[PDB]
């Protein structure tokens, strides 16, 4: 198991994201961003997550779309 090739981080993130999106909306509510970043071992300081909410959702739609999420964290 030590030699087993790992999933690409972007593809692990895609899997997590779809899991938090059981209705396949293509997005999550921005209230779930914290949970998704913690599940992916990303920095989860509250003020940092609020900067990231604003970077990802500049139009204020209240949602995090998959595309922008992967683009910021797993380009």
């Amino acid at each position: 198991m030590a030699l087993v090739a790992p999933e690409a981080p972007s593809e692990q993130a895609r899997r997590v994201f779809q899991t938090y999106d059981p209705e396949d909306n293509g997005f999550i509510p921005d209230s779930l961003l914290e949970d998704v970043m913690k599940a992916l071992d990303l920095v989860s300081d509250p003020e940092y997550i609020n900067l990231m909410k604003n970077k990802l959702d500049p139009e204020g739609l209240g949602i995090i779309l998959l595309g922008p999420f992967l683009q910021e964290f797993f380009p």
Partner: protein
């Protein structure tokens, strides 16, 4: 619509095309059709990407293999 570059331990290089959703197991099958079951039987194949072993049941898209690097096929 992706292209994997393969090196053998005889310094031979060659290209296999597959769909992102097709698994490592299907990559092995295509290698066998291309290089022969005498020398590259699917059962004896180990595919090594970046020093780690690819897993039969995993879709190839999941490793995000850049067409820059190669996959080594060992028997």
């Amino acid at each position: 619509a992706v292209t994997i570059t393969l090196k053998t331990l005889q310094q031979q290089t060659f290209k296999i095309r597959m769909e992102p959703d097709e698994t490592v197991k299907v990559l092995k099958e295509k290698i066998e059709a291309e290089k022969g079951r005498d020398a590259f039987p699917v059962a004896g194949q180990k595919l090594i990407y970046a020093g780690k072993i690819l897993s039969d049941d995993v879709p190839i898209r999941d490793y995000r293999i850049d067409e820059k690097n190669f996959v080594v096929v060992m028997v």
